[PDB]
C-alpha cells in the first residue's frame, strides 16, 4: 500500500476517533476512485487484460480496508460503541468491519477471481441455434415480442441453461468465502450484513407485513393475466387453476409484465398507452431519450448532467466488435467530477423508464458529491433506487406523454384510467413478489438453510410460492436458474428494489402534494414543479448522513415504509380487477401447484 494511504497515529478516545475518521475519508476517496475506474474500464470492454487490472484494483482496496480497519480496532474496538456522536459511531463501526479484507491474501485473490469469472459468464453467455443470440438485445426482444410458445421456450431454456449451469460451482465457492469474511466482522453470515444497512431490528417482519397487504393485488392481477394468456395460448399451455409458465409474461424473469400489455388491455379503443411505436415512427434514438430525461430533472431545478457525463457515458451497445456488460448501470467515480451511465439503450417506452431510473442514480451522486465519501450513499439503498422511478411515474402519465409529443389523443374517462392503472400494475405490481423473493432465496443460501444440493429446488419453491409461475421445461439441481439473473453472479443485493417499489409511491404522494396538485394521485405530473424539486433535493443532498427513518419523516411525514400510498394509487384498478375476476369465476391463486405445461410437439424445433 502506498505510504500516502496508510493510517498514522491517533489518540485512543473519542476526540482522536474524530481525527481518525477525518483522515480515513481523505484517503478513502483516492482508493474509491481507482476501484471505480478499474471496474468501468472492464465492463465497457471485456478483455482478459482489463479483468486482471480490475482484480489488482480490488486487491488494493482490501489492503486499505485492512490497514485502517486494524487501526480502528487497535484504538477504538472496546469504546466506539459508547461514543456520544452517532455519526461517528456509524463511521467507526463501518471501518472496523473489514469484509473480504479479513480474508488472507490467497483467499482474497480467489474471491476477486470468482467475482470476475462470475461476471464474465453472465455477460458473455449466448444461445446458439453457427450463429448465436445475446441476452441484450436478441433474447430480450424475443421474450418481449414473440408470441410463439416454442420460440419463447427456446430462448428461456437456452438462456437459463447457458448462464446458470456453469455458474453453480463458482457461486458455491463465492458464498463460502463471503461468509468466511463477514463472520470475522461479527455477522452470522453475509445476508445479515446486507440486512444491517437498513438499521431496523424488525426488518424481515416489517417486509413480510408489507407483502401481506400487497399480495391480494398481485393475486388478482395474476388471475386476470392468466385468463388473457389462456385465450391466446389455449388450455394445453395455460392452466386456469395452476401456475403460469415462466416464459410467457414478456420478460426473461417474468418480473415485469409491461410487454404483454397488448394482450391484457381492457379497453383497446382508448388511446394506446404503449408509445414505443410512436418513438420508432418519430425516430427517437438513445441520445434523445437521455436528453428528455435530463430536461425533466432540470424542470425541477435539479442539476443537468455535466459535460464529463456526456463525454464519458456509453449510451448504446458498441457495434465495433467489443464485448461489454449490457446490463444498465450508473457510476460514481468518487472524484466529484466523473459520473457516467453505461446502457445498451433500445428505443422503447420501458427503456425510457430505465433511462430515468439510471439518471436518478446520477442525480443523487451529483447532489451529495461534496459530503465525506462515506456519506455518499442513499439514506438506505432503496432510496437510491426510488429517485428515478418517481420521476418516471410522472413521465408515464398520458397527460405528460401528450406534452412531449408521444400521445396525440387526450382522454379523461374511467376506461382510460383503468387502462393506465392496469399498464402500471403490469410494471409495478407484477414485480413485487419477485422483488421480495430474490433475497429470501439468497439469505437462505448465505445462512446455510439452502445448501448447494437445494439451490434450484428452493429457487423454484419461492418462484411458485410468490409469483405463481412454473418452469416450462423440467429442471433439476444441475440447473442453477437463480444464476441466470444478473444480480446473483454480480453479487448485487435485491431487497432494495422491493423497498423502492413501495417507497416510490410514498415519494410520489409527498411530491405531488408539495407541488400543489389536487387531482387523483395516478394523474399527478410533477413536471416543472420547483417546489417538488426542492423537497426532493433535500433528500438527495443528505446522502447517508442521517438515519433513513428521519429523512423519510422530513419528506413524507412518516418514519416507516408504508403500503398505503401504493394502494391509493392503484385503488380503482384493484377494485376493477377484483370485480372482473369474480364475474369471470376465476380461481385466485394456483392450487394445482404441481402443474407444468407439456413440451411442444416438435420441440426443440
Ligand X SMILES: CS(=O)(=O)N[C@@H](CCCCN)C(=O)NC[C@H](CC1(C(=O)N[C@@H](Cc2ccc(O)cc2)C(=O)O)CCCC1)C(=O)O
Ligand Y SMILES: *[C@@H]1O[C@H](CO[C@@H]2O[C@@H](C)[C@@H](O)[C@@H](O)[C@@H]2O)[C@@H](O[C@@H]2O[C@H](CO)[C@@H](O[C@@H]3O[C@H](CO[C@H]4O[C@H](CO)[C@@H](O)[C@H](O)[C@@H]4O)[C@@H](O)[C@H](O)[C@@H]3O)[C@H](O)[C@H]2NC(C)=O)[C@H](O)[C@H]1NC(C)=O
Ligand Z SMILES: *[C@@H]1O[C@H](CO[C@@H]2O[C@@H](C)[C@@H](O)[C@@H](O)[C@@H]2O)[C@@H](O[C@@H]2O[C@H](CO)[C@@H](O)[C@H](O)[C@H]2NC(C)=O)[C@H](O)[C@H]1NC(C)=O
Measure the N-to-C terminal CA separation of the chain; round to a whole number of Å: 57
Task: Give the C-alpha distances (Å, rounded to integers) separating 41 from 139, 340, 431, 450, 488.
Answer: 26, 12, 32, 35, 22
- Asked if 463 and 479 count as a contact pair (C-beta separation under 8 A), the reply is no
Q: Which of 204, 399, 559, 592 binds ligand Y (CB under 6 A)?
A: 399
Which is the catalytic residue, given 230, 288, 402, 487? 487
Closer to ligand Z at the Cβ: 168 or 361?
168
* Helix/strand/coil for 522: helix
Q: Is 385 in the site for Zn ion (CB under 5 A)?
A: yes
**596 annotated as ligand-binding:** no
Cβ 34 to ligand NAG shortest distance, Å: 17
Q: Which of 21, 221, 273, 330 binds ligand X (CB under 6 A)?
A: 330
Closer to ligand Z at the Cβ: 439 or 481?
481
Segment near ligand Y (CB under 6 A); pick from 56-64, 75-83, 117-125, 512-520: 512-520
Contact partners, residue 299, CB within 8 Å, separation at least 6: 527, 528, 533
Contact string 249-288 vs Mg ion (x = CB under 5 A): -------x-xx-----------------------------
Instruction: Check whether the bond before 322 is cis (ω within 30° of 0).
Output: no
> CA 164, 215, 145: angle at the middle one, nearest 5?
50
Beta carbons within 10 angstroms of residue 64's beta carbon: 23
- Asked if 375 and 314 count as a contact pair (C-beta separation under 8 A), the reply is no
358 is catalytic: yes
Contact partners, residue 239, CB within 8 Å, separation at least 6: 592, 595, 597
Q: Which of 23, 30, 34, 45 binds ligand NAG (CB under 6 A)?
A: 45
Q: Residue 567 belongs to what H/E stretch?
A: helix 564-583
Q: Which of 298, 412, 414, 478 binds ligand Z (CB under 6 A)?
A: 478
Sign for the pseudo-dihedral over CA of 133, 134, 138, 140: positive
400 is catalytic: no
Closer to ligand X at the Cβ: 71 or 522?
522
Beta carbons within 10 angstroms of residue 513's beta carbon: 17
Q: Is 378 in the site for Cl ion (CB under 5 A)?
A: yes
**361 annotated as ligand-binding:** yes
Dihedral, CA atoms, 310, 314, 315, 320, nearest 10 degrees?
130
* 47 binding partner (options ligand NAG, ligand Z, Mg ion, none; Cβ < 5 to 8 Å by kind): ligand NAG
Q: Is 516 in the site for ligand Y (CB under 6 A)?
A: no
Segment near ligand Y (CB under 6 A); pick from 35-43, 241-249, 424-432, 518-526: 518-526
**357 annotated as ligand-binding:** yes
3-state DSSP percent of the chain in helix, strand and coil, to 5: 60, 5, 35
- Asked if 576 and 569 count as a contact pair (C-beta separation under 8 A), the reply is no
Contact partners, residue 569, CB within 8 Å, separation at least 6: 421, 424, 505, 508, 509, 521, 522
Closer to ligand Y at the Cβ: 461 or 517?
517
Which is the catalytic residue, given 358, 427, 509, 586? 358
Contact string 218-257 vs ligand Y (x = CB under 6 A): ----------------------------------------
Beta carbons within 10 angstroms of residue 236's beta carbon: 10
Task: Give the C-alpha distances (Å, rounded to integers) separating 38 from 67, 103, 330.
Answer: 21, 21, 15
Contact string 271-310 vs ligand X (x = CB under 6 A): ----------------------------------------
Q: Is 194 in the site for ligand X (CB under 6 A)?
A: no
Q: Which of 112, 329, 348, 464 binds ligand X (CB under 6 A)?
A: 329
Closer to Mg ion at the Cβ: 256 or 419?
256
- CA 255 from centroid of its chain's CA atoms: 11
Chain position whose Cβ is nearest to ligand Y: 519
Q: Is 56 in the site for ligand NAG (CB under 6 A)?
A: no
- Asked if 312 and 290 count as a contact pair (C-beta separation under 8 A), the reply is no
Contact string 382-421 vs Cl ion (x = CB under 5 A): --x-------------------------------------
**What's the rounded Cα separation, in Å, for the pair 63 and 107?**
13
* 350 binding partner (options Cl ion, Mg ion, ligand X, none; Cβ < 5 to 8 Å by kind): Mg ion
Q: Is 385 in the site for ligand X (CB under 6 A)?
A: yes
**What's the rounded Cα separation, in Å, for the pair 254 and 399?**
29
**Active-site annotation, residues:** 358, 487
Give binding residues as ranges: 198, 357, 361, 385, 496
Residues that bind ligand X (CB under 6 A): 328-331, 353-354, 357-358, 361, 378, 381, 384-385, 389, 497
Residues that bind Cl ion (CB under 5 A): 377-378, 381, 384, 493, 496
Residues that bind Mg ion (CB under 5 A): 256, 258-259, 348, 350
Residues that bind ligand Y (CB under 6 A): 399, 412, 518-520, 523
Amino acid at each position: 500500500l502506498d505510504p500516502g494511504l496508510q493510517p498514522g497515529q491517533f489518540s485512543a478516545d473519542e476526540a482522536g476517533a474524530q481525527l481518525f475518521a477525518q483522515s480515513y475519508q481523505s484517503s478513502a476517496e483516492q482508493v474509491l476512485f481507482q476501484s471505480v475506474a478499474a471496474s468501468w474500464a472492464h465492463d465497457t470492454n471485456i478483455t482478459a487484460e482489463n479483468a486482471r487490472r480490475q482484480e489488482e484494483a480490488a486487491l488494493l482496496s482490501q489492503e486499505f480496508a485492512e490497514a485502517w480497519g486494524q487501526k480502528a480496532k487497535e484504538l477504538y474496538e472496546p469504546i466506539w460503541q459508547q461514543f456520544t456522536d452517532p455519526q461517528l459511531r456509524r463511521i467507526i463501526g463501518a471501518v472496523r468491519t473489514l469484509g473480504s479484507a479479513n480474508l488472507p491474501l490467497a483467499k482474497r485473490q480467489q474471491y476477486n477471481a470468482l467475482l470476475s469469472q462470475m461476471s464474465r459468464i453472465y455477460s458473455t453467455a449466448k444461445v446458439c441455434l453457427a450463429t448465436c443470440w445475446s441476452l441484450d438485445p436478441d433474447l430480450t426482444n424475443i421474450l418481449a415480442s414473440s408470441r410463439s410458445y416454442a420460440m419463447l421456450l427456446f430462448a428461456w431454456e437456452g438462456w437459463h441453461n447457458a448462464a446458470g449451469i456453469p455458474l453453480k460451482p463458482l457461486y458455491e465457492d463465492f458464498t463460502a468465502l463471503s461468509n468466511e469474511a463477514y463472520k470475522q466482522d461479527g455477522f452470522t453470515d453475509t445476508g445479515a450484513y446486507w440486512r444491517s444497512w437498513y438499521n431496523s431490528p424488525t426488518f424481515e417482519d416489517d417486509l413480510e407485513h408489507l407483502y401481506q397487504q400487497l399480495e391480494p393485488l398481485y393475486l388478482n392481477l395474476h388471475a386476470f393475466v392468466r385468463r388473457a394468456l389462456h385465450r391466446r395460448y389455449g388450455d394445453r399451455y395455460i392452466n386456469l387453476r395452476g401456475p403460469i409458465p415462466a416464459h410467457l409474461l414478456g420478460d426473461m424473469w417474468a418480473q415485469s409484465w409491461e410487454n404483454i400489455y397488448d394482450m391484457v388491455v381492457p379497453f383497446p379503443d382508448k388511446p394506446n398507452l404503449d408509445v414505443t411505436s410512436t418513438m420508432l415512427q418519430q425516430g427517437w434514438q438513445a441520445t434523445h431519450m437521455f436528453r428528455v430525461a435530463e430536461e425533466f430533472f432540470t424542470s425541477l431545478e435539479l442539476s443537468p448532467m455535466p459535460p464529463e457525463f456526456w463525454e464519458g457515458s456509453m449510451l448504446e451497445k458498441p457495434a465495433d466488435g467489443r464485448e461489454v456488460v449490457c446490463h444498465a448501470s450508473a457510476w460514481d467515480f468518487y472524484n466529484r467530477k466523473d459520473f457516467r451511465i453505461k446502457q445498451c439503450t433500445r428505443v422503447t417506452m420501458d427503456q425510457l423508464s430505465t433511462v430515468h431510473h439510471e439518471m436518478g442514480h446520477i442525480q443523487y451522486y451529483l447532489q451529495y458529491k461534496d459530503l465525506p465519501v462515506s456519506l455518499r450513499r442513499g439514506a438506505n439503498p432503496g432510496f437510491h433506487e426510488a429517485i428515478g422511478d418517481v420521476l418516471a411515474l410522472s413521465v408515464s402519465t398520458p397527460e405528460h406523454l401528450h406534452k412531449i409529443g408521444l400521445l396525440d389523443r387526450v382522454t379523461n374517462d374511467t376506461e382510460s384510467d383503468i387502462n393506465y392503472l392496469l399498464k402500471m400494475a403490469l410494471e409495478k405490481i407484477a414485480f413485487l413478489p419477485f422483488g421480495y423473493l430474490v433475497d429470501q432465496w439468497r439469505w437462505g443460501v448465505f445462512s446455510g438453510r439452502t445448501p448447494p444440493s437445494r439451490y434450484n429446488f428452493d429457487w423454484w419453491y419461492l418462484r411458485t410460492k410468490y409469483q405463481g409461475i412454473c418452469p416450462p421445461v423440467t429442471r433439476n439441481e444441475t440447473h442453477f436458474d437463480a444464476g441466470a439473473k444478473f444480480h446473483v453472479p454480480n453479487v448485487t443485493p435485491y431487497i432494495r428494489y422491493f423497498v423502492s417499489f413501495v417507497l416510490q409511491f410514498q415519494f410520489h404522494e409527498a411530491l405531488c402534494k408539495e407541488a400543489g396538485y389536487e387531482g387523483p394521485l395516478h394523474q399527478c405530473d410533477i413536471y416543472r414543479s420547483t417546489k417538488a424539486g426542492a423537497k426532493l433535493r433535500k433528500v438527495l443532498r443528505a446522502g447517508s448522513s442521517r438515519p433513513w427513518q428521519e429523512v423519510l419523516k422530513d419528506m413524507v411525514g412518516l418514519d416507516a415504509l408504508d403500503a398505503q400510498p401504493l394502494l391509493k394509487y392503484f385503488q380503482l384498478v384493484t377494485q376493477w380487477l377484483q370485480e372482473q375476476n369474480q364475474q369471470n369465476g376465476e380461481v385466485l391463486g394456483w392450487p394445482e401447484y404441481q402443474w407444468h405445461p407439456p413440451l411442444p410437439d416438435n420441440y426443440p424445433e
